[PDB]
Symmetry: C3
Subunit: 376 residues, 3 copies
């Protein structure tokens, strides 16, 4: 049984009858007619909505934290997956696996109509990347967010602001282990690791990069993949953030990301070698330094290099101190934020040092990444 | 009447005949056939195109200002609304309500085909938020944009540059009261007001937040809703902007946004308390200071905190002047731009003072929000 | 041959038998029925997927460089065009026109299903802009990208990093002549030219705008189209980049964009007047200074104004040197990056001079443009 239609050319001058239906054999699609309009009204093929993702409210993430280890996908969420339409007419709970503290999770909507979370970032368990479509994700943090200005506990839970969908996410290449600050931008939850190449910039429980344990050399910038930079200069940390589509914080970004940390306090001890854990001889616990947004070790554990210049200038005369890539002249200091483990009273969300030249390297100087917030 | 059916599983290994129409009982959709392809060619369900919005020219707003109190939606605009498709094949006038000077309006495309503007940002008069879709809006200014470099006048009219649509808008979380500057970025039309929590950062005829009468404390940073900040520190304004997903203008931004103001001229008198009105005992009228882009009181009224550090340094010794959030060493000044009522002939689009540290606070230091331009 | 359908009102409370097809005369669309659900299942009109563009991997450009003068469109690409659906199920070679060194090309997809490049940015030869759709583009460079840190050659070829599609492009208002740096942002390939108004900012083999040969006044800021600026001031270059929706680079950006250049080397000679060719009396070839991402004359040719302030301040009193647009107090120098031709061995990817005020101008002070990377 066949309905006669012709080419798109044929259809162009053809006017079907009110409620008549022809077939465009060029497009392979149905065309509805109204008995008055030349060409009719072609319908859309499904190939042209492949990957559609409609949220009821586009200005907020697609999910909700319902408990410490539970989350729901919001009502009104329409999702194309593997030729099929999956939609949720009411808030729907997301099936979780086991949740280890300090790990990242991806959220999948599957072609059977079920929504599941998983530690794997290609496909969840018992599905392929064709049967399941990754739509978002979250971080399962070691501790809670700062309920006020004292920090948070050490109850492992979902970081409410680490929730991202594919149209409400960090601008950077990989969205993992970042958190939405004030709904304005994204900050790395953890300070930059040494193995940022395999781990990402922001990972829980890894060696923190500093003047000594300097970061792996960026492969985008002539790094071989296991070699590290010879020092912990600003130049080096700035190079690393670029490689991951991020930048160092500015003052206004820092004072914001780190709010909620315990002010004018430091980790104490002789070192903070590891993200999310207590420092070597720490006189106060890591979670005392946890922002309102779940930025871990926000302040007073390690100075982060910044992306702003000013303060104390170097020699008013050309100096070749740039890892042998040119010379500086009257070179202003590159900001350092937060304080480190050993400035007791000095540390905090607005703590700022404008003395160090960008070529300076010390074991109190690391970095935290940021990037824009993109809503689509 | 009922057509040859089958499940997606069944459709998979089935080749229909040229112009045969089958129904996929799983997908609930029509499938066109060509007598050649396995599985045929499934059509798209309308849900997967919900909220669609297609512009003819994607790098321009969807509307044209046609006169002081009239504007039109451009030809080629296709809007999905409430299951319906509404489109404008020619330029169509937008139905205006009463327009009061210094008001923001929203533009709605209704399912009955009409396009109207209303002061209400949820639904126009005699429509539900289902039957009408908000697609953009504009600001009805209290005066003209600056034709030359002598400011504008006092004739209420649509600021042409203030037109935004859902895919051509300020990146900020709320589009109201902003104006697009040289198609590069968005700027607040008005200086930051005290009650920015209920008014947004930019609003006509409100009290201008300054060092004395400072801004309401930010909800997202531990404000309660009634509390003001203690003073008008750079730190505070910076934080108020971050709240609304805006930031302070940099030098390049400022010089762009303020262009068209009457250069080397100040308001005179003793104070500027209100946005969009004349200053207290002022010597030249407020519109003298309107920019090419409809930025009201662009210069020579209040200094605006910028987002750039440099110039005169504070003490070369840690100082706890950050409202109790850490200490600062050799802190460079936060830039201020524009000049103020007392500024005499120093005011203008490139007026810049690199003196005050971020901790300073005066009755002639305020702020203006800027943000990114979003084209989708 | 009619199908019994009615209005949307009517459809609202109606249930067809499983596989009954009706016509919504309001929406002019087909409605599938299941036997259970009221209102049925309205299908999507083609209008609502007009301009659709679907990549298999959204985080990468849609094309692949296959050799010096050949490229393919990636498998999985789906393009709506002129009411039709063109789609590439495997890597398909783009049809190349005649390739000339230092020219931008636009990649089109056409309703006859063919994919071709062309120097015309409206339509390829033998098509209207209705039958062909601009989807991407690239730069045919005068030399090669930097293999390591010695620069490149003079073999004309496709700069692989200059590939852009409509959902993977410079945020700038016009994507021509840019190249993506480490996947984080886009940088102009060429130093800003005098006739940027008609050439864009980044164009091969034109006069490089400097202090003597100042650029043309932006028509967005009072320029007429003929008039040049009186000097090569930071203020002016900054104005020019705003006009084109770009920024002056920052330090983190510059070290990135210029990486791969021959470090500690300058053009030598007396002057460098033209983009992409050797300087007047130069002692090193122009391609010696070609970056990893094919930034041409990246360093050691002209100081490029930066978008950072710090270093040497100026008169600690209100000076009016902003070309009549107000006064500056204790004005911090504007950064200058890369070094110039005279600079000798100071020049390089990190060469930075914080001495010159924003009002200074010299015949070795130019600019390069940058903008964000847009992914959709
Ligand atoms: Mg800056
Ligand atoms: Mg600075």
């Amino acid at each position: 049984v066949q309905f006669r239609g012709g080419t798109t050319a044929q259809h162009a001058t053809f006017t079907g009858a009110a409620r008549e239906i022809t077939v465009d054999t060029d497009k392979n699609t149905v065309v509805v007619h109204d008995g008055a309009t030349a060409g009719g009204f072609p319908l859309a093929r499904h190939d042209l909505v492949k990957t559609a993702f409609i949220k009821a409210d586009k200005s907020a993430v697609a999910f909700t934290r319902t408990g410490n280890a539970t989350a729901s996908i919001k009502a009104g969420t329409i999702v194309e997956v593997n030729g099929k339409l999956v939609q949720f007419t009411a808030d729907t709970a997301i099936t979780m696996p086991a949740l280890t503290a300090g790990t990242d999770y991806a959220i999948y909507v599957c072609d059977d109509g079920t929504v599941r979370a998983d530690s794997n970032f290609s496909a969840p368990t018992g599905y392929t990347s064709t049967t399941a479509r990754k739509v978002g994700g979250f971080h399962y943090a070691p501790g809670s967010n700062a309920a006020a200005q004292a920090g948070g506990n050490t109850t492992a839970q979902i970081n409410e602001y680490s929730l991202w969908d594919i149209k409400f996410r960090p601008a950077a290449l990989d969205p993992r282990g970042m958190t939405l600050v004030a709904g304005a931008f994204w900050a790395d939850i953890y300070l930059l690791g040494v193995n940022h190449l395999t781990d990402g910039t922001s990972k829980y429980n890894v060696t923190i990069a500093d003047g000594s344990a300097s970061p792996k050399k960026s492969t985008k910038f002539g790094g071989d993949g296991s070699a590290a930079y010879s020092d912990g200069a600003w130049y080096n940390f700035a190079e690393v953030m670029t490689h991951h589509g991020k930048r160092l914080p500015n003052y206004n970004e820092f004072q914001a990301l780190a709010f909620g940390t315990t002010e004018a306090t430091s980790s104490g001890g002789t070192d903070v070698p590891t993200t999310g854990v207590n420092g070597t001889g720490a006189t106060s616990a890591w979670n005392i330094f946890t922002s309102k947004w779940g930025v871990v070790q926000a302040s007073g554990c390690l100075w982060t290099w910044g992306n702003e210049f000013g303060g104390v200038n170097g020699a008013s005369e050309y100096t070749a101190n740039t890892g042998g890539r040119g010379s500086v002249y009257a070179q202003p200091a590159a900001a350092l934020f937060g304080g480190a483990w050993n400035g007791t009273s000095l540390s905090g969300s607005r703590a700022a040092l404008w003395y160090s030249g960008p070529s300076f390297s010390f074991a109190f100087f690391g970095a935290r990444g940021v990037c824009d917030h993109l809503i689509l």
